[PDB]
Design an enzyme around this catalytic site. Structure first.
Site, PDB file in Angstrom:
ATOM      1  CG  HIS A  15      -1.899  -1.076   1.152  1.00 48.79           C
ATOM      2  ND1 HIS A  15      -3.220  -0.837   0.851  1.00 48.79           N
ATOM      3  CD2 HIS A  15      -1.760  -2.414   1.263  1.00 48.79           C
ATOM      4  CE1 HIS A  15      -3.864  -1.988   0.843  1.00 48.79           C
ATOM      5  NE2 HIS A  15      -3.000  -2.959   1.082  1.00 48.79           N
ATOM      6  CG  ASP A 113      -8.659  22.176  -1.343  1.00 47.80           C
ATOM      7  OD1 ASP A 113      -9.084  22.985  -0.485  1.00 47.80           O
ATOM      8  OD2 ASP A 113      -7.603  22.388  -1.983  1.00 47.80           O
ATOM      9  CB  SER A 236       8.563  -6.729   2.656  1.00 44.85           C
ATOM     10  OG  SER A 236       9.574  -6.675   3.636  1.00 44.85           O
ATOM     11  CD  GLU A 307       8.548  -4.069  -8.402  1.00 46.49           C
ATOM     12  OE1 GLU A 307       9.777  -3.827  -8.567  1.00 46.49           O
ATOM     13  OE2 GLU A 307       8.072  -4.680  -7.393  1.00 46.49           O
TER      14      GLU A 307
HETATM   15  O1  LIG Z   1      -7.295  -9.408  -0.768  1.00 44.14           O
HETATM   16  C1  LIG Z   1      -6.539  -9.425   0.407  1.00 44.14           C
HETATM   17  C2  LIG Z   1      -6.832 -10.404   1.407  1.00 44.14           C
HETATM   18  O2  LIG Z   1      -7.846 -11.347   1.190  1.00 44.14           O
HETATM   19  C3  LIG Z   1      -6.091 -10.359   2.596  1.00 44.14           C
HETATM   20  C4  LIG Z   1      -6.138 -11.365   3.715  1.00 44.14           C
HETATM   21  C5  LIG Z   1      -5.957 -12.695   3.288  1.00 44.14           C
HETATM   22  C6  LIG Z   1      -5.875 -13.748   4.191  1.00 44.14           C
HETATM   23  C7  LIG Z   1      -5.933 -13.456   5.568  1.00 44.14           C
HETATM   24  O3  LIG Z   1      -5.859 -14.546   6.505  1.00 44.14           O
HETATM   25  C8  LIG Z   1      -6.057 -12.094   5.977  1.00 44.14           C
HETATM   26  O4  LIG Z   1      -6.105 -11.767   7.344  1.00 44.14           O
HETATM   27  C9  LIG Z   1      -6.142 -11.042   5.060  1.00 44.14           C
HETATM   28  O5  LIG Z   1      -5.094  -9.479   2.723  1.00 44.14           O
HETATM   29  C10 LIG Z   1      -4.757  -8.526   1.815  1.00 44.14           C
HETATM   30  C11 LIG Z   1      -3.697  -7.608   2.116  1.00 44.14           C
HETATM   31  C12 LIG Z   1      -3.341  -6.616   1.205  1.00 44.14           C
HETATM   32  O6  LIG Z   1      -2.273  -5.701   1.479  1.00 44.14           O
HETATM   33  C13 LIG Z   1      -4.064  -6.565   0.005  1.00 44.14           C
HETATM   34  C14 LIG Z   1      -5.093  -7.470  -0.267  1.00 44.14           C
HETATM   35  O7  LIG Z   1      -5.817  -7.420  -1.462  1.00 44.14           O
HETATM   36  C15 LIG Z   1      -5.448  -8.469   0.655  1.00 44.14           C
END
Ligand SMILES: O=c1c(O)c(-c2ccc(O)c(O)c2)oc2cc(O)cc(O)c12
Length: 402
Positions: A15, A113, A236, A307
């Site tokens: 993110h 804004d 990561s 990438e």
């Molecule tokens: O689509 C996503 C998703 O399903 C999950 C997720 C999957 C399995 C787990 O056990 C959990 O706790 C979270 O994480 C995400 C983390 C991101 O940065 C972006 C994502 O799109 C997902």
């Protein structure tokens, strides 16, 4: 004529990095932004702080809310496992009041804004955006194929609220280009966005520790032919386990092809020198752009998808978690622009035949690569002037003034 934007990135690589790649585009188009972050998340904004003067780029650091389920001093998800995101959500939820406070102590000519926060933090950011009558624009680094699959889920939770809030925001920005998945961009826009406002901006290109960035470039240059080497990296934050790695190290050796592989540490015999090993941080963008790399062995993250695509490399899927399977569905199956090399989050391929068809991607003209290249041409056209994403970057800045 230019807006004031308050950005609120979600503290994780996937993110965080594109989010800031976007704030560069906002500023490049004349805006002035203020980035709210947490103490150890300040390093991220270092490069951006350099390229933009203190008049146009401002930082609002608030102390990380304390949480019983987060170990002390951790402020991002690089470090926790992915299953511990729901506590990062509640933790940062508590950031609501201090932001509200900070914004109220502001002259109304300094109040932004629009807020450009992550959709993962939309539930409470949207609550702030209303109180001060600011436009809440959401950001996700995933493609609309994933959003359409995710939002359509019947049991969405614990993701439900952030998905509802995102659906209720002013609009949504994603890191994709339109011609790649128009069916799904329109799915999301019509079916999951109350005001049907969606900006596709990708590929958000980025702006510019065990082995230095320069010595690795000399290594790569020391390799013709072009596309010789395969880059293997899960980065990561998905980490391996010791039995799985020995399967991979065995798969890597039997292939007899040059590689790079960024992470006893395992395996125990590093000593066969056609491929190099980087502990910690690696210059992925530069590696993949380099002429000598022709293949990326990736968990198939969307950031890695773009990438690898921009870098023009054969994409070898090993999806493990998060959106990797949505990407696998789209890129391997529906688009036949990749090739799936691991099944499962805890798969092991038999090293010997895995080594076989990975080496067959030192050909390298597998029609996967030709499919992905035509995709990349469309991505490049998308971002260069007149393209869908470029024009979308313009309209997004334009709309924040409204
Ligand atoms: O689509 C996503 C998703 O399903 C999950 C997720 C999957 C399995 C787990 O056990 C959990 O706790 C979270 O994480 C995400 C983390 C991101 O940065 C972006 C994502 O799109 C997902």
């Amino acid at each position: 004529k230019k807006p004031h934007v308050l950005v609120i990135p979600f503290p994780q690589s996937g993110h965080m990095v594109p989010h800031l790649d976007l704030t560069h585009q906002i500023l490049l188009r004349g805006a002035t932004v203020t980035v709210l972050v947490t103490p150890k998340n300040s390093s991220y904004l270092d490069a951006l702080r350099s390229l933009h003067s203190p008049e146009h780029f401002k930082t609002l650091i608030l102390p990380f809310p304390s949480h019983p389920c987060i170990p002390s001093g951790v402020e991002s998800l690089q470090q926790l496992p992915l299953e511990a995101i729901v506590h990062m959500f509640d933790a940062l939820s508590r950031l609501h009041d201090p932001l509200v406070d900070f914004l109220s102590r502001q002259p109304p000519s300094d109040l932004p804004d629009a807020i450009l926060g992550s959709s993962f933090l939309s539930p409470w950011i949207n609550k702030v955006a209303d109180a001060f009558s600011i436009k809440s624009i959401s950001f996700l680094p995933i493609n609309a194929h994933s959003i359409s699959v995710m939002w359509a889920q019947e049991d969405r939770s614990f993701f439900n609220d952030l998905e509802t809030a995102t659906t209720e925001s002013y609009g949504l920005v994603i890191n994709s280009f339109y011609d790649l998945e128009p069916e799904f961009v329109e799915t999301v826009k019509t079916r999951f966005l109350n005001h049907h406002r969606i900006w596709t901006v990708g590929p958000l290109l980025p702006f510019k520790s065990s082995i230095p960035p320069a010595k690795v470039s000399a290594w790569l240059d020391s390799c013709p032919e072009d596309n010789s080497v395969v880059y293997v990296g899960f980065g990561s934050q998905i980490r391996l386990t010791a039995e799985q790695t020995a399967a991979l190290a065995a798969a890597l050796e039997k292939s007899s092809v040059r590689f790079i592989w960024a992470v006893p540490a395992g395996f125990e015999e590093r000593v066969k020198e056609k491929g190099l090993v980087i502990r910690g941080w690696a210059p992925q963008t530069m590696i993949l752009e380099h002429r000598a790399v022709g293949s990326y062995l990736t968990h198939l993250g969307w950031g890695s998808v773009l990438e690898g695509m921009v870098g023009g490399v054969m994409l070898l899927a090993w999806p493990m978690q998060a959106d990797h399977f949505f990407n696998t569905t789209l890129i391997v199956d529906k688009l036949r622009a990749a090739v799936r090399v691991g099944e499962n989050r805890d798969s092991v391929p038999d090293s010997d035949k895995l080594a076989r068809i990975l080496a067959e991607s030192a050909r390298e003209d597998l029609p996967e690569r030709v499919t992905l290249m035509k995709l990349r041409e469309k991505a490049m056209e998308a971002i260069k002037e007149g393209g869908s994403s470029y024009k979308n970057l313009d309209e997004l800045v334009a709309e924040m003034c409204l």
